[PDB]
């Protein structure tokens, strides 16, 4: 009967928790108690990027660390030149409710998606001059929360239905589909070798997926509410995800466990974006209380705060050079930060 | 300083000019949000004032005021995450199936869910108690009574402020106003002047539905600006 299967599942879950509890000799705080803390990180709004008509939901950095795509409820994507505060392209979308955007590593394509169930791919470098839609990737039955490019011809998505998928752009045919979840998948972060990826889905669980395999190769169940952001440590062995409670936690794939909660008693608002610094030493987190905190991935103590915004931070990205951080908030402004010496 | 840099700056100026042009259309276009059951008749009203897919956007302008009305379709059962998008809209339009006695409770549960969200606290709600003529047939030709599914209906008489259209039985008026009373019962509690609820009675054929949204949205804007000046 189903009772036997339920008991077997409960026994297996007890086994998993026993294995996780066993190999947990120390906590990252114990090891890092001798590590010299970083000082107060002061970062100033070097250049504010103005022009979105309404709230910003997503941004992504070009791989050259100068260009920048942003998405707003308006129905527009703007390609900024960070260095010169210049507009390179401005793409008018078909559906106003865009919820994600990605910049192709080669600089040739940009993606977007949202409540309209489709992921759109745009050809930036066209012989005719304008930016055109290359493909509309239909097949999902729920809002599309994150889009990330693996190559010019492969893209990975995550939508409201409990589902992430890998697409072959020249065909539009969902090479693979990823099944296991119970709620809405919110975030996504490709490894820095497009071989694995992770996703957290509105059920206090984040799953690591094999792109060529499909199998859910790991799972993590530490959180207490919805998971709103996720990213890798550059090592590829760690990812930290921020939730709709006031906690950001750090997960390691090899240990298959939680490592360190970056939370404070003074914070009650949730986390809406998480991004690691180039060295894995600074962990930026966007909050609903109008400002971005900067944490220390090893010591778990705020080393800064980016108080320059008048509304909810929504997006947060660090360059591949490690030399800037950009923040988008519901005030339609996008600010670029770096320190001074 | 170089020529190519100057030309890039000029291109950025043209882009910014087009965006400033699009402000004036973005502002001065009042977004709404249509939420309603499967049998309600949402798209019916939508087509009325206009004349795997997700959002079903529609447009209509009345007396030179732009309205940009929405409709969320193939989305999962939970309304949790994507209702945050529809913050900062002028109203939420709610349509019920008035005739189908049994589903009123599901309709009221949805109403209470929309009314008390963490977002939508400042966003008003327009009702369209739809398919009223169907209720006229349902209760004119005597059949399963409202009291069958509703206990309190036995102790209910028509309130004085009613405005029965000519040719309307005094008990059918109780039929029409009992659902309105239930939904305004939900509306009056749990809310203090930040937002309100505007009941309406609409058959499937009536044409004056765009004007009602015009008047209601005018009211929302006026009450907002009056509270901002502490005259209300």
């Amino acid at each position: 009967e189903l009772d036997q299967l339920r008991q077997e599942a409960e026994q297996l879950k007890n086994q998993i928790r026993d294995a996780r509890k066993a190999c947990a000799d120390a906590t990252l705080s114990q090891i890092t108690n001798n590590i010299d803390p970083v000082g107060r990180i002061q970062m100033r709004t070097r250049r504010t990027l103005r022009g979105h008509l309404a709230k910003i939901y997503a941004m992504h950095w070009g791989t050259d660390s100068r260009l920048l795509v942003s998405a707003s409820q308006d129905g527009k994507l703007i390609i900024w030149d960070s260095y010169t505060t210049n507009k390179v392209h401005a793409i008018p979308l078909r559906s106003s409710w865009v919820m994600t955007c990605a910049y192709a590593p080669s600089g040739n394509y940009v993606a977007c998606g949202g409540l309209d169930n489709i992921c759109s791919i745009y050809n930036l470098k066209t012989r005719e001059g304008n930016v055109r839609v290359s493909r509309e990737l239909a097949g999902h039955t729920g809002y599309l929360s994150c889009c990330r490019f693996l190559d010019d011809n492969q893209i990975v998505t995550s939508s409201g239905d409990t589902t992430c998928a890998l697409w072959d752009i020249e065909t539009g045919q969902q090479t693979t589909t990823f099944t296991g979840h119970t709620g809405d998948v919110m975030s996504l972060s490709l490894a820095p070798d497009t071989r694995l990826f992770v996703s957290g889905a509105c059920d206090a669980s984040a799953k690591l997926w094999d792109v060529r395999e499909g199998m859910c190769r790991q799972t993590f169940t530490g959180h207490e509410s919805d998971i709103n952001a996720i990213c890798f440590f550059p090592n590829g062995n760690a990812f930290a995800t921020g939730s709709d409670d006031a906690t950001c936690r750090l997960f390691d794939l090899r240990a298959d466990q939680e490592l360190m909660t970056y939370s404070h008693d003074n914070i009650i608002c949730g986390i809406t974006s998480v991004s690691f610094s180039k060295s894995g030493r600074l962990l930026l987190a966007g909050y609903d209380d109008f400002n971005c905190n900067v944490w220390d991935a090893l010591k778990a103590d705020r080393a800064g705060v980016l108080a320059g915004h008048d509304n909810r931070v929504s997006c947060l990205g660090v360059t591949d050079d490690g030399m800037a951080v950009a923040t988008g908030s519901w005030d339609s402004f996008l600010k670029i930060w770096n320190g001074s010496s | 300083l170089s020529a190519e840099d100057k030309a890039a700056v000029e291109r950025s100026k043209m882009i910014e000019k087009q965006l400033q042009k699009d402000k004036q259309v973005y502002r001065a276009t009042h977004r709404l949000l249509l939420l309603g059951a499967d049998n309600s008749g949402k798209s019916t009203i939508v087509k009325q004032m206009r004349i795997t897919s997700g959002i079903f956007e529609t447009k209509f302008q009345v007396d030179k005021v732009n309205f940009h009305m929405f409709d969320v379709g193939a989305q999962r059962d939970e309304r949790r995450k994507w209702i945050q998008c529809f913050n900062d809209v002028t109203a939420i339009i709610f349509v019920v199936d008035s005739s189908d006695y049994n589903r009123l409770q599901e309709a009221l549960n949805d109403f209470k869910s929309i009314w008390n969200n963490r977002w939508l606290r400042t966003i008003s709600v327009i009702l369209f108690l739809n398919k009223q003529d169907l209720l006229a047939e349902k209760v004119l030709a005597g059949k399963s009574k409202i009291e069958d599914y509703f206990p309190e209906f036995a102790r209910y008489t028509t309130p004085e402020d009613a405005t029965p259209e000519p040719g309307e039985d005094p008990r059918v008026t109780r039929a029409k106003y009992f659902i309105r009373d239930e939904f305004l019962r939900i509306s009056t509690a749990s809310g203090d002047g930040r937002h309100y609820c505007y009941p309406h009675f609409t058959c499937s054929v009536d044409t004056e539905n765009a004007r009602r949204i015009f008047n209601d949205c005018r009211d929302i804007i006026q009450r907002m600006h009056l509270r901002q000046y502490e005259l209300l």
Partner: single-chain antibody, 230 residues
Framework: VQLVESGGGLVQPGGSRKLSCSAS????????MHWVRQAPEKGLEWVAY????????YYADTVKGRFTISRDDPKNTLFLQMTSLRSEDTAMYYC??????????????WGQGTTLTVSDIVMTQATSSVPVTPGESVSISCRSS???????????LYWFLQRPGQSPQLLIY???NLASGVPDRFSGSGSGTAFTLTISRLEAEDVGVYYC?????????FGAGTKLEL
């Protein structure tokens, strides 16, 4: 993309004539245009410029108070109103498109040309002819008066190739890049004053005249050509 322009022929000295360039196949409003001219047996020479939005217009010293440039975005045509034509205006006028944003490739398409016949920075191409046999690696040079390396990293040297009876064609933009449809053989290097264009394995479709242009500041000035014969 396809640009054709017409409006040339014999004109008595002192007259006037309008040249029109009918663009079709690309978003004309997003591109700024140029006019470049080629004397009957000489090199290239920049003539005018009108930008996207029609807001910036430049000319050359020898046509400035005498020629005007205008565009019609809805009709996808570009004009050049020549007035009081002198005998030094016999040339093969071209209609060159150029878009300027971060990472663009200016001078990426050249029209076929129209024939007109009337009855500050110096770019030196000391060489003027090079014999070569197929499969040998060539190296064409070009020198500058000022230093073209602007403070922002760009070098603003352009290289072109016009084959025996064809319109020119972009090979290198900003001294180190490759146009869209150009073989990997071509490669350009330079220091900031002295420049080279190195073909790896020459083929019979590579014979022609190679031109170097600067784009640091107006006016734009060309070389004299470096013909490769076979």
């Amino acid at each position: 993309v396809q640009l054709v322009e017409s409006g040339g022929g014999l004109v008595q000295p002192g007259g006037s004539r309008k040249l029109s360039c009918s663009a079709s196949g690309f978003a004309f409003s997003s591109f700024g245009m140029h006019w470049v001219r080629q004397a009957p047996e000489k090199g290239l020479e920049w003539v005018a410029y009108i930008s996207s939005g029609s807001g910036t217009i430049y000319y050359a010293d020898t046509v400035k108070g005498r020629f005007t440039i205008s565009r019609d975005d809805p009709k996808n045509t570009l004009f050049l109103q020549m007035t009081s034509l002198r005998s030094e205006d016999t040339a093969m006028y071209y209609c060159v498109r150029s878009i300027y944003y971060y990472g663009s490739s200016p001078f990426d398409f050249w029209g076929q040309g129209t024939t007109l016949t009337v009855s500050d920075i110096v770019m030196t191409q000391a060489t003027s002819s090079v014999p070569v046999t197929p499969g040998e690696s060539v190296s064409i040079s070009c020198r500058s008066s000022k230093s073209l390396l602007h403070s922002n990293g760009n070098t603003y040297l352009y290289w072109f190739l016009q084959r025996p009876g064809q319109s020119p064609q972009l090979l290198i933009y900003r001294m180190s890049n490759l146009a869209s449809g150009v073989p990997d053989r071509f490669s350009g290097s330079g220091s900031g004053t002295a420049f080279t264009l190195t073909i790896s394995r020459l083929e019979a479709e590579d014979v022609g005249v190679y031109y170097c242009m600067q784009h640091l500041e107006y006016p734009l000035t060309f070389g004299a050509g470096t013909k490769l014969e076979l």
